[PDB]
Subunit: 153 residues, 3 copies
């Protein structure tokens, strides 16, 4: 257990928290961004205010978060949750194992989901679409419409 | 590495797991709730069964989870994922950097999304709506309708 | 802090990382899968490429991730976020406290949400539906229709 006078803490062979208020726990775990936190062997939180939790996880974007083995978040404001998830667009969010949020301000929801269009939320990919269930009827213009509502027309 | 007979583990300058089965790792990391887990400098898992992971992350609600630097989950049953995400409503869920789910039983999906109505899931905020894609056609009454179904009705 | 020549790290009474590139931190924390990461007392990352973070969390599925106190991911490709969240279906994703993504290829979004139909995404459960808000109008056949669009047909 190695500590610094600037709030860094590390543990594991070759683990290095050098950014200030850093935490790096795991073999060759690295937290080089300010306010950065890395957990798992070869985890890498190099972005400022980044968080990389999971073996070979990586969060190199500013304000990025990658959680799950081999998860990646290279976009600024990008967040990836799930083993092998990638959030690579600016302000993107990938939630699901092997999900990919590639476009800016996009989200990909579910395992293997891909978001390749700006400002959109993807629940799968072409030929692998998912039904959205337990949706209460929409009220405002920008609420989703459910089947009971479509049928009422 | 400090350990107690009651399942607590602490590592870091001033790191303190004191709640029973606590784990606190990072400078001034604090796990004071029962079964609490805190990782990162100044991380604070103070709710019973809370989990705060990331620098300055905070999970003070009972059963709360905050993952991401500066993430916060002060609501009971609340879960926040993303840097600066905030799940402040009871049973709220905020998934995306700087997302906010303030209302009870709500969810905010995507960066900067705001959920301020109860029992609702927001995919953005007013003037910043997001489109929902790769949606299979709705089958049951409470499923979403897609554009293909809307077009077949416009006939 | 114990370390192996095969990249394992463990800290805590009875902590054990034995799979290769493993990390196990906390009282009786266990990381037995390859490339596995466990944080918290009794946390258990026994799947290959699994990640279990939170007191008593479990990720026993291959490539599974469980984050939150008592969160569970026994399914292959399963990801659970939130206290007591369970993603048990193959390729399922449970996001929210006490959410359950049970069916293969399903997702449960929101506290207490249940997904029991394959290839579907649930925002609640029967009699506990949630409104989806801040949805831009759909463009492609497989985009969700919003209310403005529905009303544009109604006339
Ligand atoms: Cl940066
Ligand atoms: Cl953007
Ligand atoms: Cl696609
Ligand atoms: Cl202790
Ligand atoms: Cl002891
Ligand atoms: Cl509490
Ligand atoms: Cl910021
Ligand atoms: Cl409510
Ligand atoms: Cl396995
Ligand atoms: Cl894989
Ligand atoms: Cl399926
Ligand atoms: Cl089309
Ligand atoms: Zn800061
Ligand atoms: Zn930020
Ligand atoms: Zn296929
Ligand atoms: Zn307990
Ligand atoms: Zn609970
Ligand atoms: Zn604006
Ligand atoms: Zn591997
Ligand atoms: Zn995988
Ligand atoms: Zn799978
Ligand atoms: Zn009920």
């Amino acid at each position: 257990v190695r500590t610094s006078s600037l709030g860094d803490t590390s543990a594991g062979n070759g683990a290095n928290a050098s950014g200030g208020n850093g935490t790096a726990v795991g073999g060759a775990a690295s937290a080089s961004g300010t306010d950065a936190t890395a957990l798992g062997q070869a985890s890498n939180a190099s972005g400022n205010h980044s968080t990389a939790l999971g073996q070979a996880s990586s969060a190199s974007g500013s304000g990025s978060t990658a959680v799950g083995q081999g998860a990646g978040a290279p976009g600024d404001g990008a967040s990836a949750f799930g083993q092998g998830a990638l959030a690579s667009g600016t302000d993107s969010t990938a939630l699901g194992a092997h999900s990919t949020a590639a476009a800016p301000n996009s989200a990909a929801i579910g395992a293997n989901s891909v978001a390749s269009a700006p400002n959109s939320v993807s629940f799968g990919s072409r030929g692998h679409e998912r039904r959205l269930t337990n949706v209460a009827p929409g009220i405002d213009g920008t609420d989703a419409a459910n089947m009971n509502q479509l049928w009422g027309v």
